[PDB]
């Protein structure tokens, strides 16, 4: 036989979304075509990001896209999120934006259309620029979820600043023997 180990013989990555949504699958039917028949890797990245899960396309907020479009050089470009452009209320002045997203929430698109921008979805994005030229692709904060506070090096282990799982934050609830220098030992 061969001296081949078969542990990593299969890639784990997706071939399709695990959604039975039909609009996302029509977007996939369009971007499969643009990915295999253009030579632009923007189409490959947006194909990968249509494939992903709700938790791996986190909601990008309007304040982040304000900042990452106000960076110099990228004036009158097209910002493109594959997640959800949510409204951010701790921002006042909204410039003219050119946003492409799967879904924009109601008062976020109200804010953008009041500022005088334009929200175009992915089908008319592929009509507007097939290779994706003139586009700032963007992503929400993927470590923004609260469940990453618990991950990594375990609590009760030195120099590990990890939020533990407690039913109620208080005085009585896991403050005593591992946390103190008087009561026992401190990590």
């Amino acid at each position: 036989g061969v001296d081949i180990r078969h542990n990593k013989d299969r890639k784990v990555r997706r071939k399709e979304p695990k959604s039975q949504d039909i609009y996302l699958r029509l977007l996939v039917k369009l971007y499969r075509f643009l990915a295999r028949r253009t030579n632009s890797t923007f189409n490959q990245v947006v194909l990968k990001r249509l494939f992903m899960s709700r938790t791996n396309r986190p909601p990008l907020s309007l304040s982040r896209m304000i900042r990452k479009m106000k960076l110099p050089g990228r004036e009158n470009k097209t910002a493109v999120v594959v997640g959800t452009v949510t409204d951010d209320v701790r921002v006042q002045e909204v410039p003219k934006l050119k946003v492409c997203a799967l879904r924009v929430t109601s008062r976020a698109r109200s804010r953008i259309l009041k500022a005088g921008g334009k929200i175009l979805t992915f089908d008319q994005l592929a009509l507007d620029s097939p290779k994706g030229r003139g586009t700032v692709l963007l992503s929400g904060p993927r470590k923004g979820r609260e469940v990453y506070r618990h991950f990594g090096k375990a609590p009760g282990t030195p120099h590990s600043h990890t939020k533990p799982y407690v039913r109620s934050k208080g005085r009585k609830f896991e403050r005593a023997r591992g946390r103190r220098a008087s009561r026992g030992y401190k990590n």
Binding site: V89, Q92, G156, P164, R175, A176, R177, G178, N187
Partner: protein
């Protein structure tokens, strides 16, 4: 549903997904959270530190209504009041400043976290942070107490 679970593909398999050497016995480690001091010491120190022992004073008849003081920040300060107050106050020529009664919106204490826009206010709270007060003064405006 039961149709999609794992007992529908563990039929024909003798141990039903629990093993031949270690049988699926009833309670091999004790019931519940037992043996924390003794034989689950490593789990309760590697994953729930601080768990055993007493710490802090005891307060017998506690009342959350007495300890009630919910906070708001300055970046959310203008979201309490509608947009036309803010645009009429930026448009206003006489320097009259709008009055944000934060207790009417439902927050007793104002803390200062965010950037506050260059626009005079009268913030009418029950408690203030030092930095919240000085950001209101630095933008120009007043800090009014209510009881």
């Amino acid at each position: 549903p039961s149709r999609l679970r794992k007992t529908r593909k563990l039929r024909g398999h003798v141990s039903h997904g629990h093993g031949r050497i270690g049988k699926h016995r009833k309670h091999p480690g004790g019931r519940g959270n037992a043996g924390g001091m003794h034989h689950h010491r490593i789990n309760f120190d590697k994953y729930h530190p601080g768990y055993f022992g007493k710490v802090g004073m005891r307060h017998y008849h506690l009342k959350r209504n007495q300890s009630f003081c919910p906070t708001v920040n300055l970046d959310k300060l203008w979201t309490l009041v509608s947009e036309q107050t803010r645009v009429n106050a930026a448009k206003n020529k006489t320097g009259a400043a709008p009055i944000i009664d934060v207790v009417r919106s439902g927050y007793y204490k104002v803390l200062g976290k965010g950037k506050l826009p260059k626009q005079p206010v009268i913030v009418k709270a029950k408690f203030f942070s030092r930095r919240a007060e000085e950001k209101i003064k630095g933008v120009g405006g007043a800090c009014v107490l209510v009881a």
